[PDB]
Amino acid sequence: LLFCPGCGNGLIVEEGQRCHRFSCNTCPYVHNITRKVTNRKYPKLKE
Amino acid sequence: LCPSDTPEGEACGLVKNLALMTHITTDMEDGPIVKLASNLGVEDVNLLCGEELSYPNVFLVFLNGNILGVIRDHKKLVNTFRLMRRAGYINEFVSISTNLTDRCVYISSDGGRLCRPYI
Amino acid sequence: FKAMGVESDQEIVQMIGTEEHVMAAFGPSLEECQKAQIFTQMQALKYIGNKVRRARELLASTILTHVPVKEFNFRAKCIYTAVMVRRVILADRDYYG
Amino acid sequence: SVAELLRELSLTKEEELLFLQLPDTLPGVGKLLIRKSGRVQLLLGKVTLDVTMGTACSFLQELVSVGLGDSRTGEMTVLGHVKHKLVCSPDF
Amino acid sequence: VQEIDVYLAKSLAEKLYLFQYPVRPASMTYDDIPHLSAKIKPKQQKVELEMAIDTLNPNYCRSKGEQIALNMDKQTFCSSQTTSNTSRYAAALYRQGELHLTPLHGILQLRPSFSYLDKADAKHRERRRVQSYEFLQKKHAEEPWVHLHYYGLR
Amino acid sequence: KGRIEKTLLGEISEYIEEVFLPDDCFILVKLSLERIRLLRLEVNAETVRYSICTSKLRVKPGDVAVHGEAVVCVTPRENSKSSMYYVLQFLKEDLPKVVVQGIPEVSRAVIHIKYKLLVEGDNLRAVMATHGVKGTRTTSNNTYEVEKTLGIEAARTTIINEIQYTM
Ligand SMILES: [Zn+2]
């Protein structure tokens, strides 16, 4: 969940040319190859 | 309540009996409770949405089930109301309790609460 | 929440959880499910309430979570609903308090 | 962090706009005393000692101080932003 | 033992109205001095401004075109007031040598006004109670003749 | 035990996430391999890829790939139903709850000591048929799942037994 500076309506990623155009007034930050990272480490019980 | 005074049959634990040294409370006004709450420190409707959250110093005061602001220091509020009640400025029956699992202090002036005296 | 006056979605998470660790899992639950249908509007989101409630729902949101008081300043009502959601994501009927 | 702001205020001379919630006292130069150990007390008018210390998380948003001059006949001008809030409580 | 004294500064604080922003915490966003087209009300401020959007983000383009009204592009605000009792908060400007108290007027929050989706739906249509009060304002909403400008003043 | 009790993709992996590369957004799973050898069970990134497939999450083509050293799987993006982002935020939830291997119905299996193992499950003949369990000697306590699987006459003998066991 990354929010919009300007309306604040949550993250939407359009897969055209790597932007973040929200359903409202366009504020598409065309993030370059900066690699997105979201590793939500899970749980690993054993034995 | 009495632990051993109950019927058996249909009402094995559903019809209880009051103990000796109890006292059910009556209602009262909520004037001086709020008036000491807003002096002792609380603030609501101007605080950013984020404040009342996982941050430890956000115990939110609740009176009778309605939020009345948030206090950074729960101890000063619970202790000051308790000294005030003992002094007699607030009604003897009102009770300030704190749940630390969810940071909500609970000022109850409900009326109908089962009460009891201690030294 | 959008019917209650807080229209933006940034405000709603800020209400529920700013520290994200499980309150981020409020995110793809509902505010995406809100956004999955293009329905960002405050007046339009009274309208979905205005159908199922068997502009006309500014009043009939007073018969919902009553004792949180409102003088058509719904800010006090929102936090009490947000705290009700706050419990669930953090999650005794017979106890004599 | 209760008295830190005053020491931070001491660290940089830049004037800092502050937000103060005084207690609800009607009018029946004030003095602020910082006790050893950080227990700031404002010995306000009537010589009462009011303890003011800490507050809600602040700066988590932009709070801005603006003097509305009735711009139709004046100007609305932002004068400062905001700093940590301060709450004043009567003492017993 | 900093014994700094607090002046009960009588410099008129009737002008002082705190503005709040539960919108801009991500990167110390300052609202920025240049934007004008300023519109403000005394009661329920409804600050309407020239928050013109950048063009560094790449044009936005067709969806902006799809917006219908944009007048560059106003990102206006409607003030959520919280002025019930409004003297509980009255602090001002504080050096490490002097302290000036000033009692403010009602604080007002300033979340972003949309009205683009509001007007947008109406457009499709073309294709409460005493809401404004008894006097319909006839004035508070009319008052927006506004000039946000920079002056060192106390 | 690991062969017959279910283990979700979630239980066996390291830090999963989507990763943003130009013109796409592919998810990734790091798949804790110390564990997979610790818990005696036989999964591999090929076996996960077959199990990410045919798993009702519409990833039925070969869109899911197998990177690394059989240590990481990747599925980029679906075809339709708001396929640009809203299926990927959909995909991050259902992906660490697909059963990698084992009988999906069985909640968990607990060993007990000679050695036997009792399960809290219901899928009987899928348990009876696995490798290592002598399916000639295995009983239930659910007299319907003996009737569906083992005939009526074994369902008679459990109604005799499981009453005379609880009496
Ligand atoms: Zn936007």
DSSP states along E26-75: TT-----S-----B--SSS---B------STTT--THHHHHTS-------
Report helix, strand and coil shares of chain E as percent, to nearest 5: 10, 15, 75
- Which residues of chain C have a CB within 8 Å of the CB of B102? 86-87, 90
Mutate to test the interface with F, among C32, C33, C39 (most CBs of F within 10 A): C32
What tokens appear for F149 in the block?
């699987």
- Closest to C9 in 3D by CA, of F8, F54, A7, A47: A7
CA of D7 to the centre of ligand 1 (A): 40
Cα–Cα distance for residue pair C34/A1, rounded to 1 Å: 14
Cα–Cα distance for residue pair D12/D26, rounded to 1 Å: 34
Cα–Cα distance for residue pair F113/F93, rounded to 1 Å: 38
Residue at token pair 């009588």: E10
- Residue E93 is inside which H or E element, if any? strand E93-94
CA of F88 to the centre of ligand 1 (A): 20
Question: For residue A19, what is the nearest residue in chain F, using CA coordinates?
Answer: F23
What tokens appear for E11 in the block?
């410099």
CB atoms within 10 A of CB A9: 21
Cα–Cα distance for residue pair B118/E21, rounded to 1 Å: 49
CA of C29 to the centre of ligand 1 (A): 20
Strand partners for F74: F65
DSSP assigned state of B116? -
Q: For residues A11 and F92, is the Cβ–Cβ distance under 8 A?
A: no
DSSP assigned state of D60? S
- CB neighbour list of residue B113: distance below 8 Å, 6 or more residues apart: B24, B25, B93, B95, C97
By three-state DSSP, how is residue E89 classified?
strand
- Closest to B91 in 3D by CA, of B31, B43, B44: B31
Residue at token pair 């009790």: F5
Mutate to test the interface with E, among B39, B44, B46 (most CBs of E within 10 A): B46
Cα–Cα distance for residue pair F38/E47, rounded to 1 Å: 63
Q: Contact B84/D23, CB-based, under 8 Å?
A: no
DSSP assigned state of D47? G
Residue at token pair 């948003």: D61
Residue at token pair 């007048």: E71
CA A20 distance to own-chain centroid: 7
Question: For residue D9, what is the nearest residue in chain E, using CA coordinates?
Answer: E96
Q: For residues E77 and E110, is the Cβ–Cβ distance under 8 A?
A: yes
Q: Among residues 88-107 of chain F, which lie with CB inside 8 Å of chain A?
A: 88, 92, 96
Cα–Cα distance for residue pair B50/B7, rounded to 1 Å: 52
Q: Please, after which residues is chain F broken with C–N above 2.5 Å?
A: 113
- Residue B11 is inside which H or E element, if any? none
Q: Which residue from F18, F35, F84 is facing A38, i.e. has the nearest CB?
A: F18
Strand partners for B107: B63, B96
- CB neighbour list of residue A42: distance below 8 Å, 6 or more residues apart: F10, F11, F13, F16, F96
Cα–Cα distance for residue pair D48/B74, rounded to 1 Å: 24
CB atoms within 10 A of CB C30: 15
Question: For residue C23, what is the nearest residue in chain A, using CA coordinates?
Answer: A1
Cα–Cα distance for residue pair F11/A46, rounded to 1 Å: 9
Distance from CA of F163 to the nearest CA of C (A): 35
Pure H helices in chain F: 33-38, 45-52, 86-94, 124-128, 143-149, 153-166
Q: Is E32 left (phi over 0), alpha (psi -120 to 50) or beta?
A: left
What tokens appear for B86 in the block?
């003992």
CB distance from A13 to chain F under 8 Å? yes
Distance from CA of F23 to the nearest CA of A (A): 5
Q: Contact C24/A1, CB-based, under 8 Å?
A: yes
Cα–Cα distance for residue pair F43/F31, rounded to 1 Å: 10
Cα–Cα distance for residue pair C96/C93, rounded to 1 Å: 9
Mutate to test the interface with C, among B2, B49, B96 (most CBs of C within 10 A): B49
- Which residues of chain D have a CB within 8 Å of the CB of B84? 92
- Which residues of chain B have a CB within 8 Å of the CB of C90? 102
Residue count of chain C, please give it: 97
- Closest to F7 in 3D by CA, of C26, A46, C91: A46
By three-state DSSP, how is residue C47 classified?
helix
Q: For residues E78 and E113, is the Cβ–Cβ distance under 8 A?
A: yes
CA B14 distance to own-chain centroid: 26
Q: Contact F90/C36, CB-based, under 8 Å?
A: no
Cα–Cα distance for residue pair F71/F66, rounded to 1 Å: 8
By three-state DSSP, how is residue E6 classified?
strand
CB distance from C36 to chain E under 8 Å? no
What tokens appear for D16 in the block?
């800092």
- Residue D80 is inside which H or E element, if any? strand D76-80
Long-range Cβ contacts of D69-75 (<8 Å, 24+ apart): D69/E15, D70/E42, D70/E143, D71/E38, D71/E40, D71/E145, D71/E146, D71/E147, D72/E143, D72/E144, D72/E145, D75/E147, D75/E148, D75/E149
Q: What angle do CA F91, F97, F101 make, to 5 degrees?
A: 125
Cα–Cα distance for residue pair A2/A8, rounded to 1 Å: 9
What tokens appear for B99 in the block?
């749940």
How are strands ordered across the β-sheet holding E16-21?
A: D76-80, D62-68, E16-21, E108-109, E80-81
Rg (CA), chain F: 20
CB distance from E111 to chain C under 8 Å? yes
CB distance from C36 to chain F under 8 Å? yes
**C9-16 helix and C75-90 helix, angle to the nearest 10 degrees:** 60
Q: What angle do CA B9, B14, B17 make, to 5 degrees?
A: 105
User: Could you tell me whether strands D85-90 and E80-81 are parallel, antiparallel, or unpaired per DSSP bridges?
Assistant: unpaired
Q: How far is CA A34 from CA A30, A37, E54, F25, in A?
A: 10, 9, 21, 12
Cα–Cα distance for residue pair D53/D39, rounded to 1 Å: 7
What tokens appear for E52 in the block?
């013109």
Distance from CA of E117 to the nearest CA of C (A): 6
- Closest to E99 in 3D by CA, of D29, D5, D26: D29
Alpha-carbon dihedral sign for residues E58, E59, E61, E65: positive
- Closest to E119 in 3D by CA, of C19, F38, C41, C80: C41
CB distance from C8 to chain E under 8 Å? yes
Q: Which residue from A7, A26, A30 is facing E64, i.e. has the nearest CB?
A: A26
- Which residues of chain C have a CB within 8 Å of the CB of B45? 73, 75-76
Backbone angles phi and psi of D24, in degrees to 5 = -80, 70
Cα–Cα distance for residue pair B67/B62, rounded to 1 Å: 4
From start to end of B1-119, where are the E strands?
23-24, 60-63, 66-70, 95-99, 104-108, 114-115
Q: Contact C41/E129, CB-based, under 8 Å?
A: no
Q: For residues B105 and B96, is the Cβ–Cβ distance under 8 A?
A: yes
By three-state DSSP, how is residue D58 classified?
coil
Question: For residue C79, what is the nearest residue in chain B, using CA coordinates?
Answer: B49
- Residue F129 is inside which H or E element, if any? none
End-to-end CA distance of chain F: give it in Å, rounded: 30
Residue at token pair 């089930």: B65
Q: For residues E88 and D24, is the Cβ–Cβ distance under 8 A?
A: yes
CA C10 distance to own-chain centroid: 13
Q: For residues E63 and E91, is the Cβ–Cβ distance under 8 A?
A: no
CB atoms within 10 A of CB E89: 20
CB pairs B-E closer than 8 Å: 13
Ligand-binding annotation for F58, yes or no, is yes
Q: What is the dihedral of CA E99, E104, E109, E115, to 10 degrees?
A: -130
Mutate to test the interface with B, among C15, C85, C89, C92 (most CBs of B within 10 A): C15
- F32, with CB counted inside 10 A (0-12, 13-18, 19+), is buried
CB atoms within 10 A of CB B4: 5
By three-state DSSP, how is residue C32 classified?
helix
Residue count of chain E, please give it: 154
Cα–Cα distance for residue pair E75/A6, rounded to 1 Å: 7
Pure H helices in chain B: 31-40, 74-87
Q: How far is CA E5 from CA D9, D91, E94, in A?
A: 14, 20, 10
Q: For residues E34 and B60, is the Cβ–Cβ distance under 8 A?
A: no
Strand partners for F72: F67
